[PDB]
Amino acid sequence: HGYIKEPVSRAYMGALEKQTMGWTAAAQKYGSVIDNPQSVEGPKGFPAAGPPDGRIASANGGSGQIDFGLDKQTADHWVKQNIRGGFNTFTWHYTAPHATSKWHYYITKKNWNPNKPLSRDEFELIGTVNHDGSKADTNLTHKIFVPTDRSGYHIILGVWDVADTSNAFYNVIDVNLT
């Protein structure tokens, strides 16, 4: 269990807006993830397997731990944060830092549709961090090159594949790319 804390993952933005908007208003916006940003958990093997299209952002209900609120997708729904093209760092916060196979990072393609459910074919791989099966917390922060050929609203997907389970953690990040 864990989430991407910097940049602020959509899930963690849910936790953060719980403090500012209140439990009811934040939950209306994000669903039940506001209480458990660490539990966006689904089957591993993305992209050939894993959560189906339209269920990527919630990891298909987080294996029962959360609802489908993260799967809404509109140009306007989510809080964007600014990021620059080029090298960026991605820091996970862990509540249970399981033995890990890899992390892998994707960005939406230049022509993606921000008003449709997220699908695999809208993402391209941008970096892969292989791990030796040791606990996640032996490599907390990953240096990933975000494409410089792209601007405006994009989604970065970070995925954490857990070595000792059939699962992975899926954290979309809403970004304004400059």
Side-chain angles (χ1 to χ4, degrees):
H1 289 57
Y3 55 85
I4 303 169
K5 182 193 180 56
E6 178 113 340
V8 176
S9 69
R10 178 187 303 175
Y12 180 41
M13 195 73 78
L16 293 168
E17 287 212 279
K18 160 185 156 187
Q19 294 305 312
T20 58
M21 278 169 66
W23 248 285
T24 297
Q28 274 163 342
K29 188 166 159 161
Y30 293 83
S32 59
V33 71
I34 67 179
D35 287 356
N36 292 308
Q38 70 270 8
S39 320
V40 192
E41 184 183 7
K44 65 184 183 184
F46 186 93
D53 294 338
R55 296 282 175 239
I56 299 170
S58 83
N60 210 358
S63 311
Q65 297 169 105
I66 62 181
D67 58 26
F68 297 136
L70 289 174
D71 295 319
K72 302 186 168 194
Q73 193 52 62
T74 71
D76 294 337
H77 201 92
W78 307 108
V79 181
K80 285 84 180 167
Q81 47 248 342
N82 300 329
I83 65 161
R84 295 315 313 277
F87 280 123
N88 272 279
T89 58
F90 294 78
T91 302
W92 291 73
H93 176 75
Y94 298 103
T95 61
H98 280 248
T100 301
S101 299
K102 68 174 180 191
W103 303 260
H104 43 133
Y105 290 89
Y106 310 71
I107 194 166
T108 41
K109 294 170 174 174
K110 219 296 106 64
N111 64 1
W112 79 295
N113 190 336
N115 294 301
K116 303 290 179 181
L118 296 175
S119 54
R120 284 151 175 74
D121 66 352
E122 293 188 292
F123 286 96
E124 58 180 300
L125 184 68
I126 62 167
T128 298
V129 185
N130 299 108
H131 202 68
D132 58 6
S134 60
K135 294 181 191 282
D137 58 354
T138 67
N139 188 8
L140 295 162
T141 297
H142 312 135
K143 193 156 191 199
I144 299 288
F145 193 83
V146 174
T148 58
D149 59 351
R150 225 159 290 210
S151 62
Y153 179 31
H154 287 278
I155 289 167
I156 298 169
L157 170 69
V159 187
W160 169 38
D161 284 10
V162 170
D164 73 333
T165 74
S166 66
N167 291 334
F169 289 73
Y170 296 81
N171 277 189
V172 297
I173 309 169
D174 295 284
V175 300
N176 175 55
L177 193 43
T178 61

